[PDB]
Design an enzyme around this catalytic site. Structure first.
Site, mmCIF file in Angstrom:
data_model
loop_
_atom_site.group_PDB
_atom_site.id
_atom_site.type_symbol
_atom_site.label_atom_id
_atom_site.label_comp_id
_atom_site.label_asym_id
_atom_site.label_seq_id
_atom_site.Cartn_x
_atom_site.Cartn_y
_atom_site.Cartn_z
ATOM 1 N N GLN A 109 0.811 -1.208 0.000
ATOM 2 C CA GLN A 109 0.000 0.000 0.000
ATOM 3 C C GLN A 109 0.845 1.259 0.000
ATOM 4 O O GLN A 109 0.316 2.342 -0.274
ATOM 5 C CB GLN A 109 -0.927 0.015 1.209
ATOM 6 C CG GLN A 109 -0.184 0.164 2.532
ATOM 7 C CD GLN A 109 -1.103 0.031 3.732
ATOM 8 O OE1 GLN A 109 -1.416 -1.074 4.177
ATOM 9 N NE2 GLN A 109 -1.553 1.165 4.252
ATOM 10 N N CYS A 135 -5.082 0.519 3.725
ATOM 11 C CA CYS A 135 -5.138 -0.887 4.110
ATOM 12 C C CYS A 135 -6.565 -1.428 4.091
ATOM 13 O O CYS A 135 -6.773 -2.605 3.776
ATOM 14 C CB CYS A 135 -4.520 -1.063 5.497
ATOM 15 S SG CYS A 135 -5.227 0.072 6.733
ATOM 16 N N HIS A 138 -5.169 -1.287 11.732
ATOM 17 C CA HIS A 138 -4.622 -1.781 10.477
ATOM 18 C C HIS A 138 -5.486 -2.923 9.982
ATOM 19 O O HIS A 138 -5.685 -3.908 10.695
ATOM 20 C CB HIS A 138 -3.177 -2.257 10.637
ATOM 21 C CG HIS A 138 -2.523 -2.619 9.341
ATOM 22 N ND1 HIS A 138 -2.501 -1.770 8.256
ATOM 23 C CD2 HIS A 138 -1.879 -3.746 8.951
ATOM 24 C CE1 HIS A 138 -1.869 -2.356 7.255
ATOM 25 N NE2 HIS A 138 -1.482 -3.556 7.650
ATOM 26 N N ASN A 149 -0.753 -9.496 4.702
ATOM 27 C CA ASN A 149 -0.541 -8.077 4.936
ATOM 28 C C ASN A 149 -0.342 -7.357 3.602
ATOM 29 O O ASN A 149 -0.146 -7.972 2.551
ATOM 30 C CB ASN A 149 0.656 -7.877 5.860
ATOM 31 C CG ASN A 149 0.650 -6.532 6.537
ATOM 32 O OD1 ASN A 149 -0.270 -5.732 6.350
ATOM 33 N ND2 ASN A 149 1.668 -6.283 7.367
HETATM 34 C C1 E64 Z 1 -4.741 1.654 7.444
HETATM 35 C C2 E64 Z 1 -3.223 1.746 7.659
HETATM 36 O O1 E64 Z 1 -2.543 2.373 6.838
HETATM 37 O O2 E64 Z 1 -2.763 1.150 8.689
HETATM 38 C C3 E64 Z 1 -5.493 2.909 7.896
HETATM 39 O O3 E64 Z 1 -4.721 3.634 8.836
HETATM 40 C C4 E64 Z 1 -6.931 2.597 8.358
HETATM 41 O O4 E64 Z 1 -7.726 2.066 7.592
HETATM 42 N N1 E64 Z 1 -7.255 2.937 9.620
HETATM 43 C C5 E64 Z 1 -8.578 2.693 10.173
HETATM 44 C C6 E64 Z 1 -8.509 1.735 11.355
HETATM 45 C C7 E64 Z 1 -8.646 0.265 10.954
HETATM 46 C C8 E64 Z 1 -9.220 0.082 9.545
HETATM 47 C C9 E64 Z 1 -9.496 -0.458 11.995
HETATM 48 C C10 E64 Z 1 -9.244 4.009 10.598
HETATM 49 O O5 E64 Z 1 -8.591 4.909 11.114
HETATM 50 N N2 E64 Z 1 -10.565 4.066 10.355
HETATM 51 C C11 E64 Z 1 -11.420 5.189 10.665
HETATM 52 C C12 E64 Z 1 -11.594 6.162 9.510
HETATM 53 C C13 E64 Z 1 -10.335 6.958 9.210
HETATM 54 C C14 E64 Z 1 -10.002 7.929 10.336
HETATM 55 N N3 E64 Z 1 -10.888 9.077 10.346
HETATM 56 C C15 E64 Z 1 -10.822 10.067 9.456
HETATM 57 N N4 E64 Z 1 -11.679 11.086 9.540
HETATM 58 N N5 E64 Z 1 -9.927 10.087 8.486
#
Ligand code: E64
Length: 212
Positions: free
Chosen positions: A19, A25, A159, A175
């Site tokens: 990625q 992710c 993640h 991953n």
């Molecule tokens: C994936 C990565 O690069 O590790 C990425 O950070 C991600 O998808 N994070 C998610 C948490 C997991 C999928 C459980 C996440 O933060 N989701 C919530 C939405 C994004 C955060 N909020 C905003 N407004 N951007």
């Protein structure tokens, strides 16, 4: 369900992806599960577009993170293009699904695994690759080289990855950090510890696509 599952050995897993710096992710995880269920249902292994989900999932936040369930809901509502048709760019751009012709695949829905339940997740994985989440921020996870990973790690999941198999004492994880990380891009995470979160929170939030 059997003692060992490894969807790679049944030709249902495409090569490991990277990625990059983009927080995409959630889209890679969703795509792994779509490639898997399309192979399981149709016999063909294809690669599908993480970039399309990155650009077009309006409930997600592009490279700032997102929701595997929302990406899977997007594929069930509309569909998804082949990766060639809509290649990965590592940055969110405008949604170009409309300009790329008919969808390549479409699913019929999205179902969540009972969270915090090891047997439910193993059952799901026995039927198909599953989108799962975990805490990857810890240095032990960042530096994993091989073996059955036991941590240290917390349950602050951050993640999205994909579970593509399991064994008596691990769950097999694809991953999205390239083929040079872990076991050629995979990690085996210890299971059976009795911690309901799962090692690294692995049982927190798991989804899979449904395709009739
Ligand atoms: C994936 C990565 O690069 O590790 C990425 O950070 C991600 O998808 N994070 C998610 C948490 C997991 C999928 C459980 C996440 O933060 N989701 C919530 C939405 C994004 C955060 N909020 C905003 N407004 N951007």
């Amino acid at each position: 369900i059997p003692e060992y599952v490894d969807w790679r050995q049944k030709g249902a897993v495409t090569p490991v992806k990277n990625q990059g710096s983009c927080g995409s992710c959630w889209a890679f995880s969703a795509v792994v599960t779509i490639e898997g269920i399309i192979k399981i249902r149709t016999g063909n292994l294809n690669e599908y577009s993480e970039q399309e989900l990155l650009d077009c999932d309006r409930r997600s936040y592009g490279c700032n993170g997102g929701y595997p369930w929302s990406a899977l809901q997007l594929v069930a509502q509309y569909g998804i293009h082949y990766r060639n048709t809509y290649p990965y760019e590592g940055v969110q751009r405008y949604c170009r699904s409309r300009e790329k012709g008919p969808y390549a695949a479409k699913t019929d829905g999205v179902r969540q695994v009972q969270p915090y339940n090891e047997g439910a997740l193993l059952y799901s994985i026995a039927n198909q690759p599953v989108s799962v989440v975990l805490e990857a921020a810890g240095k032990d996870f960042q530096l994993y080289r091989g073996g059955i990973f036991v941590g240290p790690c917390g349950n602050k999941v951050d993640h999205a990855v994909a579970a593509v198999g399991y064994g008596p004492n691990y769950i097999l994880i694809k991953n999205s950090w390239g083929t040079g990380w872990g076991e050629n891009g995979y990690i085996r995470i210890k299971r059976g510890t009795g911690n309901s979160y799962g090692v690294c929170g692995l049982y927190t939030s798991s989804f899979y696509p449904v395709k009739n």
